[PDB]
Structure 1
Amino acid sequence: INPVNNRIQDLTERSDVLRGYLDYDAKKERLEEVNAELEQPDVWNEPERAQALGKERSSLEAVVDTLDQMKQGLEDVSGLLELAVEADDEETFNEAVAELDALEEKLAQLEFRRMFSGEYDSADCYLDIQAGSGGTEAQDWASMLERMYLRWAESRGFKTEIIEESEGEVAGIKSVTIKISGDYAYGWLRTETGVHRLVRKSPFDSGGRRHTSFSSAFVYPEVDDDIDIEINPADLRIDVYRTSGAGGQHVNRTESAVRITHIPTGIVTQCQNDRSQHKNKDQAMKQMKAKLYELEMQKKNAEKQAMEDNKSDIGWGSQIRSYVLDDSRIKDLRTGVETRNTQAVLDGSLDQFIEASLKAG
């Protein structure tokens, strides 16, 4: 028919998922309820509420006001060339060409919303893939799931770097660590944390029967340059006193010992090893430098442990995709995308398993 007009029905294909997910009718209808909330004289007495809302109304704009104009252009961009192809108006033929860029850039305005989820989207990330027990079949599938994403990362233009590796005793691997390098590395693979599921007839067992083996693929950026010891002497109360006393008249007179008490925290750091106050100062400053940074490593782990506590209670909800190769069927159990193209999946056909997975997530 027309590659120009079918492209419009393909922008429609990208639009309808966003129409159904965020509910652009109810997402629109939410705005008029908060217009009357904001249109009020007694909203000045809660300025924090209005400041939280004054941009919240604008957050609803770029979602609704983009889609509200987007539905109008579907008939408009298609109907422009439809009248231009009849009269063969070559200028009007070229007029609808820029019209194809009208809604697509608006769709790109929603692409901001697609990548809005995240604070390290453009950061480089790691691809850590651990294998389940499963005998050797799970060892092989970790390798089969390695090259699943290793073929895909190079299929899109991302730099693939293999940092760590651990091979199988018989065949396959055990736990490989790939570092995907480039911009938007962690952004696309953010929806890849979670266990993957394989169902196939295992070739490793002699009487080969259908094994249901699993593999997990946890990703994380691990990119930082900010380390704060907070050795600022506005803190760190210094207390100097004299030792126990074994060296006669001298050590009982010299205030050699020293204590380092942190002002915000309260941990004390004493040192009375050497004989000079100048020498015990640097050692007590060193031990305080250790005990303060090691307190920071526990608060890093405390927030990390509470982060896992929202993940350990999930259980059988950490499964991502079901690769049932006995009947040649793929099941993304999160969203509900079924595909019958397992030979093409291993090439890295997961673009269908991202557009459905990431925008809805």
Structure 2
Amino acid sequence: LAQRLEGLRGYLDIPQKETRLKELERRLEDPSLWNDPEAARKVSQEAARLRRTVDTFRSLESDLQGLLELMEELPAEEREALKPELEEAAKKLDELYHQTLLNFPHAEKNAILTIQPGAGGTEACDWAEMLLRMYTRFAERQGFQVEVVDLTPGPEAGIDYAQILVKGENAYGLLSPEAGVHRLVRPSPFDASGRRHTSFAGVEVIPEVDEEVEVVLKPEELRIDVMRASGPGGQGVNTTDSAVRVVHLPTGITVTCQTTRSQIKNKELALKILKARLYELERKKREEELKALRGEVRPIEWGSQIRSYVLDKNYVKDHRTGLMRHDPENVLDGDLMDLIWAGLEWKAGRR
């Protein structure tokens, strides 16, 4: 039965892109468009994207008719001689899956998971302590490798902050959908009456992109000036061009120095300062280009959940897709492939 839904997950993209390839393949056959060196190249990449949209619709209409006509579930001669014919043609059905997973700008490299507790205090940290081992076995079942970059306890019970680094081929694309706030509803163990309580905890995901730390400001964009020193001194402060002004032309920042009585020790001391003030205003942008590059889903409040885990009535609710799984104690072991399959369709389906 596991083949009627996946063969249709590329069937809604047919007319949406099929009628579009015609008003694009009909511009190339006229040379009048080639006069644009780039507008005739821009049209030839989408025209070259008629390679994943004119090959699949060819090797996908034979896997739905050559299998659903003589398929008896009663052991026969034309049935188990027809299963090895689609066993590598269903093992190949993953080629249409990875095409909605490998298309992220940076899903290749290892990812970073920050499991931080949220609403519910004492209980809510036990939730993050449970979600931590939940994602731990998951990345240990698929084969990936773990690095616990940070884990820190706290007061009563749970976990304060958990930062882990998981490697392996195409890892970020797998843990990118599990980026939000996961809600839990179960009988509170940290209560005397055992009341039914709810807990919130946040999960952030960010890949490992840039790593080096180098800012060699070659004196190529610097405009150094040498003005006459100001203040005390003697004949030498009047007549020697002591004061120096290093000017950063591509930015507008200007540093000055007059501490000493020499020019070569003051322009060098003004660079030991310009490099410093740059090492904070060139890293402030790697903190401001990365505070809106993560996303937005992080209120942790009551009403911002991506998935709900409840062991009371026993079920898991994916609020993105709408699915309701009934194995919560089973999802808490690492079985996430399926809700990640669906989160990589719901997420990259609106863009």
Q: Which amino acid aligns with 2:131?
A: L
In the TM superposition, residue 231 of structure 1 has moved relative to its aligned partner by: 0.8
User: Are 2:47 and 1:57 equivalent residues in the alignment?
Assistant: yes
User: Are 2:62 and 1:72 equivalent residues in the alignment?
Assistant: yes
Q: What's the CA shift string for 1:32-74, capped at 9, x where partnerless?
A: 2333355545423554333222111222431453134212233
User: Are 2:22 and 1:36 equivalent residues in the alignment?
Assistant: no
Counterpart of 1:4 in structure 2 is none
Tell me which of 164, 180, 183 is aligned to 2:166: 180
Q: Which amino acid aligns with 2:313?
A: D
Q: Which amino acid aligns with 2:277?
A: K
Counterpart of 1:101 in structure 2 is 88
User: Are 2:128 and 1:136 equivalent residues in the alignment?
Assistant: no
- The structure in which a higher percent of residues are helix is 1
**Is residue 62–residue 109 contact of structure 1 (8 Å, CA) maintained in 2?**
no
Larger CA deviation: 115-124 vs 330-339:
115-124
Counterpart of 1:6 in structure 2 is none
Counterpart of 2:332 in structure 1 is 346
Counterpart of 1:210 in structure 2 is 196
User: Are 2:216 and 1:224 equivalent residues in the alignment?
Assistant: no
**Is residue 139–residue 145 contact of structure 2 (8 Å, CA) maintained in 1?**
yes
What are the within-5 Å matches in structure 2 for residues 143-182 of structure 1? 143-182=129-168
**Is residue 152–residue 348 contact of structure 1 (8 Å, CA) maintained in 2?**
yes
In the TM superposition, residue 13 of structure 1 has moved relative to its aligned partner by: 4.2
**Is residue 139–residue 172 contact of structure 1 (8 Å, CA) maintained in 2?**
yes
**Is residue 112–residue 164 contact of structure 2 (8 Å, CA) maintained in 1?**
yes
Q: What's the CA shift string for 1:248-279, capped at 9, x where partnerless?
A: 11222221221111121121111111222111
- 2:210 is paired with a residue whose SS is coil
Give % identity. 44
In the TM superposition, residue 280 of structure 1 has moved relative to its aligned partner by: 0.9
Larger CA deviation: 41-50 vs 157-166:
41-50
**Is residue 142–residue 215 contact of structure 1 (8 Å, CA) maintained in 2?**
yes
User: Are 2:169 and 1:189 equivalent residues in the alignment?
Assistant: no
**Is residue 245–residue 252 contact of structure 1 (8 Å, CA) maintained in 2?**
no
Q: Which amino acid aligns with 1:188?
A: L
Q: Which amino acid aligns with 1:250?
A: G
Q: Distance in 2 between matches of 1:309 and 1:160?
A: 24
Q: Distance in 1 between matches of 2:158 and 2:346?
A: 34
Counterpart of 2:7 in structure 1 is 15
Q: Distance in 2 between matches of 1:181 and 1:124?
A: 4
- 1:281 is paired with a residue whose SS is helix
Q: Distance in 1 between matches of 2:62 and 2:43?
A: 28
- 2:198 is paired with a residue whose SS is strand
Q: What's the CA shift string for 1:90-134, capped at 9, x where partnerless?
A: 9xx4x97465435643x3443442223322212112111111131
Q: Which amino acid aligns with 1:147?
A: R
Q: Which amino acid aligns with 2:271?
A: M
- Between the two proteins, the alignment pairs up a number of residues equal to 345
Q: Which amino acid aligns with 1:34?
A: L
Larger CA deviation: 122-131 vs 68-77:
68-77
RMSD: 3.1
Q: Distance in 2 between matches of 1:300 and 1:89?
A: 60
Q: Distance in 2 between matches of 1:333 and 1:114?
A: 20
Larger CA deviation: 196-205 vs 164-173:
164-173
**Is residue 27–residue 60 contact of structure 1 (8 Å, CA) maintained in 2?**
no
Q: TM-score, structure 2 length as denominator?
A: 0.86
Q: Which amino acid aligns with 2:270?
A: A
Q: TM-score, structure 1 length as denominator?
A: 0.84
Q: Distance in 2 between matches of 1:304 and 1:10?
A: 40
Q: Which amino acid aligns with 1:219?
A: V
Pair 315,160 (structure 1): closer, same or farther in 2 beyond 3 Å: same
In the TM superposition, residue 317 of structure 1 has moved relative to its aligned partner by: 7.6
Pair 87,112 (structure 1): closer, same or farther in 2 beyond 3 Å: closer
Counterpart of 2:184 in structure 1 is 198
**Is residue 311–residue 329 contact of structure 2 (8 Å, CA) maintained in 1?**
no
- 1:244 is paired with a residue whose SS is coil
- 1:178 is paired with a residue whose SS is strand
- 1:237 is paired with a residue whose SS is strand
Q: Which amino acid aligns with 2:317?
A: K
**Is residue 144–residue 168 contact of structure 2 (8 Å, CA) maintained in 1?**
yes
